[PDB]
Symmetry: D3
Subunit: 231 residues, 6 copies
Amino acid sequence: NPVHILAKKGEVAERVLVVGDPGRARLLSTLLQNPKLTNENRGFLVYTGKYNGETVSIATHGIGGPSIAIVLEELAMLGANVFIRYGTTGALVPYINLGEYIIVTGASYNQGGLFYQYLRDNACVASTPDFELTNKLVTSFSKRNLKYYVGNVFSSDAFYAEDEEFVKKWSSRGNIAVEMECATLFTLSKVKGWKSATVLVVSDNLAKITKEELEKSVMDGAKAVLDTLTS
Amino acid sequence: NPVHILAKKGEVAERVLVVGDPGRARLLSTLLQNPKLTNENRGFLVYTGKYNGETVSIATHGIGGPSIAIVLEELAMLGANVFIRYGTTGALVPYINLGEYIIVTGASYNQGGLFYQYLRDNACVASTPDFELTNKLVTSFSKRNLKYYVGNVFSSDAFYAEDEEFVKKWSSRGNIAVEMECATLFTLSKVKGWKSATVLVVSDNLAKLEKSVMDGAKAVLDTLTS
Amino acid sequence: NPVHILAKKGEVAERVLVVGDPGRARLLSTLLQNPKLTNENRGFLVYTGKYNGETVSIATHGIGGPSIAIVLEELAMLGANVFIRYGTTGALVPYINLGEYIIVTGASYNQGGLFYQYLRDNACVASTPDFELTNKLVTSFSKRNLKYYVGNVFSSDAFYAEDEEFVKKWSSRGNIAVEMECATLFTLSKVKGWKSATVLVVSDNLAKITKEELEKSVMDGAKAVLDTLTS
Amino acid sequence: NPVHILAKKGEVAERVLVVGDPGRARLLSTLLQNPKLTNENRGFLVYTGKYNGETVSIATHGIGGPSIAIVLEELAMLGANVFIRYGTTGALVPYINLGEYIIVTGASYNQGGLFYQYLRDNACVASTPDFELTNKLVTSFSKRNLKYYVGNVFSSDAFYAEDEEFVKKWSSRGNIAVEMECATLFTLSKVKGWKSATVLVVSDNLAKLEKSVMDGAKAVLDTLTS
Amino acid sequence: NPVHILAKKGEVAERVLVVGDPGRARLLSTLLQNPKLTNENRGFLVYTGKYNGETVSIATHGIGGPSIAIVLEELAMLGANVFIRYGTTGALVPYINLGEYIIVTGASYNQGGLFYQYLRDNACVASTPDFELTNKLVTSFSKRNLKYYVGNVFSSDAFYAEDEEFVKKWSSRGNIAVEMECATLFTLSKVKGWKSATVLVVSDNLAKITKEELEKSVMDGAKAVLDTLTS
Amino acid sequence: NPVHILAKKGEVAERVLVVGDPGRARLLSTLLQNPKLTNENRGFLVYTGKYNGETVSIATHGIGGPSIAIVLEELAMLGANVFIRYGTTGALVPYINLGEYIIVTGASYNQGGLFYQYLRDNACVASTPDFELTNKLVTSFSKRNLKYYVGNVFSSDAFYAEDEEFVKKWSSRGNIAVEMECATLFTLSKVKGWKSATVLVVSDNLAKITKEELEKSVMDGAKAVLDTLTS
Ligand SMILES: CSC[C@H]1O[C@@H](n2cnc3c(N)ncnc32)[C@H](O)[C@@H]1O
Ligand SMILES: CSC[C@H]1O[C@@H](n2cnc3c(N)ncnc32)[C@H](O)[C@@H]1O
Ligand SMILES: CSC[C@H]1O[C@@H](n2cnc3c(N)ncnc32)[C@H](O)[C@@H]1O
Ligand SMILES: CSC[C@H]1O[C@@H](n2cnc3c(N)ncnc32)[C@H](O)[C@@H]1O
Ligand SMILES: CSC[C@H]1O[C@@H](n2cnc3c(N)ncnc32)[C@H](O)[C@@H]1O
Ligand SMILES: CSC[C@H]1O[C@@H](n2cnc3c(N)ncnc32)[C@H](O)[C@@H]1O
């Protein structure tokens, strides 16, 4: 039985939208029909409701690979199998402006720790999202005429260890943004058989945001994410 | 400036009791005189008040190395420099009963990620707490006649990977418990110049409550305010 | 000046279809209009011609990451910037039959050697193909009603070091097939700014082909690849 | 059975002269008595004939470790067990002139890929050629009054990565040349029980022809048929 | 059956004071009652005698992890289970002066050989001394009014590969000194179940001595060490 | 300025015969003309004298890579540039008998510490002896009708971590024996420009001896070694 997410079985939907910040989970729940808080233990708020004719949940995953791994595992134990992460990111290329969106196609990461414990060796396993789901997401964002970019991101483990060199290094490796939990999400999903994808809102540009404008972009895009999730 | 812990100048004390669970931070704040909630952004609760007429703070660090690193870095930017983690752990030896305490003397860990980004290579830097502060914790606990054990712990990055062969491997390596953030706390502290220590409440035994948390929080607070 | 591919400048098209076997390069050239052999040095046959209203080349890359890296680099030096690899692969899942196709979405690999020399450290850089190009490929194969599967593959460096354990290990890591040069192609392309993708013909199933049936599938699919390349 | 080198039973000799370039294999076959093309699949040309009235084969191995591993594995399945690589190399020291030869005594390499799959871990296994065969090569070359050098080489996996700092790093480590397949040849041979050696023609000097290849092929063939 | 230290069982005490220099072993045996030379094979001098109504041995461990690992293993086979390392060290910080002492709380080290062979993987096992025994040492040194510092050290494997960058790197990682065998002593003791500790005499300061001044400090603190060993 | 070997410059010869056991150094000095003890510090005995109208030193290097690295560095500072290791080894193959000799052609080793500190990365540098000098040894042993084998050895860092799996693993990797310092000697000699070689006496056979039989073999081949050193 899950020791972090204390929701009753059946209280978590098969389709889940995961966000790092609890407050955003609460804000996004207002987009659902008849939202109910199904868990608040350890600050990991989970809301379940309806969108279209489908049941869906919005869960908090906290910060970092170890945190999201725990939440995903327990949500799966509760019946979840489809996850779409909706978070913030720091752009690594100058042509992407704050507030715009990034649909992730892959995640780069430094090996070790979590990956070693799960994979049992240092192999560079392809950390990619579900192909179908990611395309559906692209379509959804395209229909709502939202400004987005398709590309790989680097999943950092040390937020406060990202100097200037850091930018040229990862941008030169085909990464257009940095975040912290996509690598874990994709790799764990591939191993567990879960279908996952991710959309990010550019909160800052490292090659060059207000809490209000963030929410404005968040809301405008969450609509595309929910349509996708329930498509 | 801090983008997660949105506290004002002078709202975070120099000495901080850090816990992973927001609920425990709240619960523990009731032991302080006139506790004030100085932050709730992203769910990371931080309280500040007095104990033994001394200013202190109790903060939430979430789960895992990446999370606690960010929290410690921001708390330090707001003025903190002494950290004592008070969490839960899974015993790796059969002779430790639930509800008892473990005063941590070191942390084993798997190389990679966070450590590589901070250390710039894969050397195994000694992950240890402040010598003096740890001895004070030992003193505070024994004075309170509490049942504690002193030993190293393994700081895991994958709670749900910790398999079968797990217990034997880590206990045969000198570790008596498993937790997830002591290695990050100790190493980052040694590197940034912070004084850190850790005491854990045994919540489960892999080889085989609130009363316990409350019972020892006093000893912890006594040490932080000495 | 390239020391392996001795084609004259302008003799290599911007769009290139790369195959491992020289014989297949020769066989596929019959699909082009007015094919001309532009290089035969070191056995790396390169043919250039037209398909639709676009100029396009078919090049031999040999076997392995080190070989394809050299060929791609020299072809790029000669003006190439778009590559689609069309090769054979060993399926890792029982539900994929010989002769069917696999459109690769990512490549897993063991770190070291080539990746270390190019990346300068052990970081697990996302080894993914161009998102747009790969979707175009999917569409092309769909229109011609070809049986294909979308997924990640493992790029092995040791053909004769792939035991039974090997299968369960990589199939459990989200890989549906094993090949030898996709990881190199994708990662080098991401670093150099080239647009690449890959389609494979299942030649064998490790969870369970004649030279004739191979060519039959090859031909039937190369038509979808060329349309994509010149789309 | 071999899926790349499609030769019949008894068409591949026990002793094989291996080269990366198909064109050189063809060229060298003219030095044999009644050479027959026993394979051309995937472009890997293999000839078999006599030299000094002795049966031998000249085979193409392509470029890089992964390619030569496959070729050696299949040649061995067809009966080969003695391999002498004859290729080109880039000198790492300024005192070696183009057209001269290097008899290889060992191969440095970066861990990973191919070696990990075969060795099952990242230990640095000594990558060396057969002691006896290498001394015979030395003897054959000196008898032919040819200018050769004896030393280790670095087997690179990325021809176009070999940067600036490159030359200084590898030459300061005891290597006098750079090539791409000696490490795979030597290690796999030690592991599979094959007798291998390597002689290289200097095609370029990073620190600063067919006549040369032909001139030394004789010494190589003399050694393979002794 | 030990092949390096040819001492007969019963001739090695449960408590052992280990030093790298055979000459220091002889000098220190002078502080014991009725010292007997129990082994001289391969130069590893071992003396056994009494101190404060307790049997104690002083053993030579040579230089480096491989050397000390062998000596500890063999002494343990002969009955030893408590070891206190008394060596010399190079200070990594400016404020520690020559002749002063360092009581070790942990040892950093570069991954590799010895550790990999014993631990069987590259995990960073906490290389720390026995808590009780170490606090005992601290108490003994205070009771003797000796100037000591308490901190971590870096156990180097290459004495002549300790340049300028070196000092800044390791001191910034929380180590106050450099020596060569503590990490091996601590880690092996944790695996084998032995109780170990270490106190070092500062012989040089890499941030900023004669063997005469050394022996004075060595002897000056030798009593504190032996008191701790027999306490 | 050496701090371990206190020999004065001019007292160490350009050619040095190195052994791990101080006792063997003394025994072998018996074969020199007018041997003089040039150093005894830290137990590292060094003798200097003549043999075949040539000055030669016999030096003790202790056990392990760290130990020998220190001794070689210091001897080199005092003028040495040619070293021949004469140690003992455990055979990994059945056909080599106790008392017979092995002339080393290369040394395998586990990555880590010492190598990382000197080389500055984990590259597998070819750890081989000087070609000319090694062929010289082979010739000397043949001229003396001594039974020898020529092959690679594995330089282990943990003597007591050599189990059953161990023997099969290393012998299958082409090594015929195990010892502890050849890889360090060869690699360091390549970096520093010294000319080194090694010949070992089989003292045990891990696949399937008294110090009396040992010394006989040691002395029996000592002349071959010294002849080579002064040839
Ligand atoms: C700024 S709050 C950090 C959180 O948002 C994402 N993030 C946004 N910007 C960045 C950045 N510049 N570096 C790393 N993570 C970032 C991460 O996934 C983490 O959970
Ligand atoms: C039980 S909630 C898990 C949290 O408590 C600690 N913990 C308690 N028991 C364990 C265990 N068995 N394994 C890993 N972490 C544990 C971790 O540091 C994490 O923040
Ligand atoms: C069978 S010929 C090997 C070539 O075809 C691909 N291949 C096909 N089947 C396999 C397999 N089972 N393992 C590895 N590579 C394979 C590789 O990319 C290599 O260039
Ligand atoms: C010049 S063609 C490259 C081929 O010859 C060898 N070679 C020649 N010169 C070099 C060089 N400078 N760097 C790497 N390999 C080289 C390689 O093993 C490869 O098969
Ligand atoms: C100079 S004495 C060398 C011995 O003392 C310790 N030591 C003293 N100073 C240093 C130093 N600067 N670097 C490394 N080890 C040192 C080591 O453990 C070694 O056995
Ligand atoms: C038993 S003598 C140990 C010494 O001789 C060599 N040696 C002899 N036998 C072995 C063995 N079985 N394993 C490792 N080293 C050995 C080592 O280099 C060490 O300095």
